[PDB]
Amino acid sequence: HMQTQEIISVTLQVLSLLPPYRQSISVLAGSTVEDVLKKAHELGGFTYETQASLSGPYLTSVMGKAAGEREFWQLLRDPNTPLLQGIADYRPKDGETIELRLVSW
C-alpha cells in the first residue's frame, strides 16, 4: 500500500531587521509555521527563540532581536494580513509568504 505527502515551498520573510531575511523553505504540507522556522534554522542563517504560553509557544526573538516592552513578533500572510493563529497552529499553503513583523502596541 502506497502512502504520499506533498512537499510545499513557503517563503519566510522578516523585514523588521537590517539586513532583511527572505528565504524559500521546503516542508511537508501540514507543517506548521513552527516547523517552517525549524527548517529555516537547520538551513543556516535563521535564528529564533520561543517561550511557552497557556495557548502554545510564541516568538520572543527573531534573528537575534528580542521583542521589548509592549512589543511582539506578529505573524502575517503576504501582503499585509495578520494571522490570528499561533506558530504551532497555522499550516501554510504552497507558495504562501509568511512574514514575522516586530510591532508595538
Residue numbers in the entry: 305 to 409
Mind quoting what the paper says about this structure?
To address the question of how Cbl mediated TC assembly proceeds, we determined crystal structures of apo TC-beta and TC-beta in complex with Cbl, putatively representing the first steps of TC assembly. We expressed the two domains of TC individually in insect cells, which lowered the affinity for Cbls while retaining the structural integrity of the domains, as no denaturing was required to generate the Cbl-free domains. After proteolytic cleavage of the MBP and further affinity purification we obtained pure, substrate free TC-beta. We next determined the crystal structure of apo TC-beta at 1.57 Å resolution, which represents to our knowledge the first structure of TC resembling a putative partial apo state of TC in the apo form (i.e. TC-alpha and TC-beta are not associated with each other). The structure was highly similar to the Cbl bound state of TC-beta (rmsd = 0.41 Å for 97 Cα-atoms), with minor changes evident in several side chains compared to CNCbl-bound TC-beta. The structures of apo TC-beta and CNCbl-bound TC-beta provide insight into distinct states of holo-TC assembly. They demonstrate the structural integrity of apo TC-beta and Cbl-bound TC-beta and therefore further consolidate the hypothesized mechanism of Cbl dependent holo-TC assembly. Virtually no structural changes occur in TC-beta upon Cbl binding, arguing against an induced fit mechanism with regards to this domain of TC. Lastly, we demonstrated that the production of apo TC-beta is a robust method to probe the interaction of TC with alternative substrates, as it is easy to produce and to co-crystallize with various substrates.
There, 10–30% of total Cbls are bound to transcobalamin (TC). Cellular uptake of Cbls occurs via receptor-mediated endocytosis of holo-TC by means of the receptor CD320. TC consist of two domains (alpha and beta) that are connected by a flexible linker. Both domains contribute to Cbl binding, resulting in sub-pico-molar affinity.
